[PDB]
Design an enzyme around this catalytic site. Structure first.
Site, mmCIF file in Angstrom:
data_model
loop_
_atom_site.group_PDB
_atom_site.id
_atom_site.type_symbol
_atom_site.label_atom_id
_atom_site.label_comp_id
_atom_site.label_asym_id
_atom_site.label_seq_id
_atom_site.Cartn_x
_atom_site.Cartn_y
_atom_site.Cartn_z
ATOM 1 N N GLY A 1 -13.877 5.281 -8.313
ATOM 2 C CA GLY A 1 -15.092 5.740 -8.962
ATOM 3 C C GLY A 1 -15.469 5.019 -10.239
ATOM 4 N N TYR B 1 -0.202 7.615 3.136
ATOM 5 C CA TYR B 1 0.309 6.845 4.257
ATOM 6 C C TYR B 1 1.832 6.815 4.265
ATOM 7 C CZ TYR B 1 -4.556 5.928 5.066
ATOM 8 O OH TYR B 1 -5.894 6.106 5.316
ATOM 9 N N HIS C 1 -2.466 7.021 -0.962
ATOM 10 C CA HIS C 1 -3.379 7.728 -0.077
ATOM 11 C C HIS C 1 -2.810 8.482 1.114
ATOM 12 C CE1 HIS C 1 -6.170 4.355 -1.704
ATOM 13 N NE2 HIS C 1 -5.876 5.253 -2.628
ATOM 14 N N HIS D 1 0.853 -1.173 0.000
ATOM 15 C CA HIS D 1 0.000 0.000 0.000
ATOM 16 C C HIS D 1 0.898 1.235 0.000
ATOM 17 C CE1 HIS D 1 -2.838 3.023 0.744
ATOM 18 N NE2 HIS D 1 -3.659 2.394 1.567
HETATM 19 C C1 LIG Z 1 -14.545 1.989 3.550
HETATM 20 C C2 LIG Z 1 -13.287 2.009 2.673
HETATM 21 C C3 LIG Z 1 -12.091 1.469 3.070
HETATM 22 C C4 LIG Z 1 -10.889 1.480 2.230
HETATM 23 N N1 LIG Z 1 -9.728 0.903 2.682
HETATM 24 C C5 LIG Z 1 -8.652 0.910 1.899
HETATM 25 C C6 LIG Z 1 -7.401 0.281 2.336
HETATM 26 O O1 LIG Z 1 -7.275 -0.280 3.429
HETATM 27 N N2 LIG Z 1 -6.366 0.341 1.466
HETATM 28 C C7 LIG Z 1 -6.402 0.959 0.168
HETATM 29 O O2 LIG Z 1 -5.395 0.929 -0.489
HETATM 30 N N3 LIG Z 1 -7.572 1.540 -0.248
HETATM 31 C C8 LIG Z 1 -8.649 1.530 0.545
HETATM 32 N N4 LIG Z 1 -9.840 2.098 0.120
HETATM 33 C C9 LIG Z 1 -9.872 2.687 -1.233
HETATM 34 C C10 LIG Z 1 -10.371 1.580 -2.177
HETATM 35 O O3 LIG Z 1 -9.449 0.503 -2.333
HETATM 36 C C11 LIG Z 1 -10.686 1.970 -3.626
HETATM 37 O O4 LIG Z 1 -9.492 2.613 -4.172
HETATM 38 C C12 LIG Z 1 -11.834 2.929 -3.781
HETATM 39 O O5 LIG Z 1 -12.986 2.421 -3.060
HETATM 40 C C13 LIG Z 1 -12.198 3.028 -5.235
HETATM 41 O O6 LIG Z 1 -13.421 3.735 -5.432
HETATM 42 P P1 LIG Z 1 -14.863 3.126 -5.417
HETATM 43 O O7 LIG Z 1 -15.318 2.969 -3.985
HETATM 44 O O8 LIG Z 1 -15.688 4.191 -6.203
HETATM 45 O O9 LIG Z 1 -14.828 1.837 -6.192
HETATM 46 C C14 LIG Z 1 -11.016 2.107 0.927
HETATM 47 C C15 LIG Z 1 -12.257 2.658 0.544
HETATM 48 C C16 LIG Z 1 -13.387 2.640 1.343
HETATM 49 C C17 LIG Z 1 -14.675 3.245 0.848
#
Ligand SMILES: Cc1cc2nc3c(=O)[nH]c(=O)nc-3n(C[C@H](O)[C@H](O)[C@H](O)COP(=O)(O)O)c2cc1C
Length: 362
Positions: free
Chosen positions: A298, A181, A179, A176
């Site tokens: 998205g 981190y 975002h 990861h």
């Molecule tokens: C509740 C939640 C938790 C997420 N946790 C992570 C995570 O632990 N690691 C990560 O790389 N992205 C995380 N994401 C981002 C998602 O992997 C993904 O990039 C994102 O949901 C893409 O958009 P979408 O929800 O429109 O499909 C998270 C998103 C949501 C909504």
């Protein structure tokens, strides 16, 4: 429908391109994988389908959310194994995302309430607030800038977690690096202004992710390693002055690693902000990369079809829609109506409510 065209992700033969994006759900009580996770992933697993788990701790100091699973102890490994077997029984392929939040933490998430670690002493500003264990929000604290010895230690943490992941039966892991981190804290020039060999130039800013990926690659094989980055996302005050260049620089590092390893990584996973300029940024990174590209952020059924069809991406990962649609793959295939998701239960602790109680098709 392009999304249902088979695809070879290294040694893994996938039957479709719909991927479960990694998502923190906070049901792993005490950082230990629970049965609930097993039911959750099993509900979404499909034959030949690829799944990426929620972010998983690589050490006691790597967390910034409540009750997120870890994989640095043998106890967590044993519990993860149970979940991987359930998922494998359905014929799914699954990767464990290794996650270290860096400065995106709080003394309440740190051992002995110590300060979170980062590339510098720069804290996330008051524009953002951290979710606390009791559901309120807190202040992101000033982080402790680590030296190169500790950096090597953190890299070792990734390597160990990766091995533990393999021991648990995972098909691979995903680093990861996005975002805002820990890894993104070294990548983005808006944060990283170090004066040693890990800061300054773009080259130096990419040193950390390069060493992290090389370490896990050397430990379990490139084809069992995926890498996620988000150069164009400024979440948690993590912005770069030249996102495309930062992205292309990371891409060059990945290509270099593959050639030096004589093998290809499982894939490059990129999350985009959510339009023509962003889409051009994504395609540019993809075109520069020698390997599998997973697009995220998205996407919908229609946008996912378009992505694979126009050759913009090999696989497409869905997050939110996968939360409320356990059988998202089937719905996308039948083009059946999707159900809505309740954000209020995205990070709660109930093992069922808002987690495994979203219904399957009508
Ligand atoms: C509740 C939640 C938790 C997420 N946790 C992570 C995570 O632990 N690691 C990560 O790389 N992205 C995380 N994401 C981002 C998602 O992997 C993904 O990039 C994102 O949901 C893409 O958009 P979408 O929800 O429109 O499909 C998270 C998103 C949501 C909504």
């Amino acid at each position: 429908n392009p999304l249902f065209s088979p695809y070879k992700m290294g040694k893994f033969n996938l039957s479709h391109r719909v991927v479960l994006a990694p998502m923190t759900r906070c049901r792993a009580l005490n950082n230990i994988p629970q049965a609930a996770l097993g039911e959750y992933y099993e509900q979404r697993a499909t034959a030949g389908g690829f799944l990426i788990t929620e972010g998983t701790m690589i050490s006691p100091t790597s967390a910034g959310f409540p009750h997120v699973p870890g994989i640095f102890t043998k106890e967590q490994v044993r519990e993860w194994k149970k979940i991987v077997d359930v998922v494998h029984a359905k014929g799914a392929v699954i990767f464990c995302q290794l996650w270290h939040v860096g400065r995106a933490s709080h003394e309440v998430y740190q051992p002995a309430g110590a300060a979170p670690i980062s590339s510098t002493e720069k804290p996330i500003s008051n524009r953002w607030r951290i979710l606390m264990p009791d559901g309120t929000h807190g202040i992101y604290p000033k982080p402790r800038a680590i030296g190169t010895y500790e950096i090597s230690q953190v890299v070792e943490d990734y390597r160990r977690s990766a091995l533990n992941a393999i021991e648990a039966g995972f098909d691979g892991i995903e680093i990861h690096g996005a975002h805002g981190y820990l890894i993104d804290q070294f990548l983005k020039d808006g944060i990283n202004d170090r004066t040693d060999e890990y800061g300054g130039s773009l080259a130096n800013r990419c040193k950390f992710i390069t060493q992290v990926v090389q370490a896990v690659v050397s430990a379990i094989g490139a084809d069992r390693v995926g890498v996620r980055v988000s150069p164009a996302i400024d979440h948690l005050d993590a912005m770069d002055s030249n996102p495309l260049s930062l992205g292309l620089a990371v891409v060059e590092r990945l290509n270099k690693i593959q050639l030096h390893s004589g093998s290809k990584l499982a894939y490059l996973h990129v999350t985009q902000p959510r339009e023509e300029e962003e889409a051009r940024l994504m395609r540019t990174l993809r075109n520069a990369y020698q390997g599998t590209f997973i697009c995220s952020g998205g996407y919908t059924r229609e946008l996912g079809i378009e992505a694979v069809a126009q050759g913009d991406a090999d696989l497409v990962s869905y997050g939110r829609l996968f939360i409320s649609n356990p059988d998202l793959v089937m719905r996308i295939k039948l083009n059946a109506p999707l159900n809505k998701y309740n954000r209020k239960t995205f990070y709660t602790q109930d093992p069922v409510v808002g987690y495994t109680d979203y219904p399957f098709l009508q």
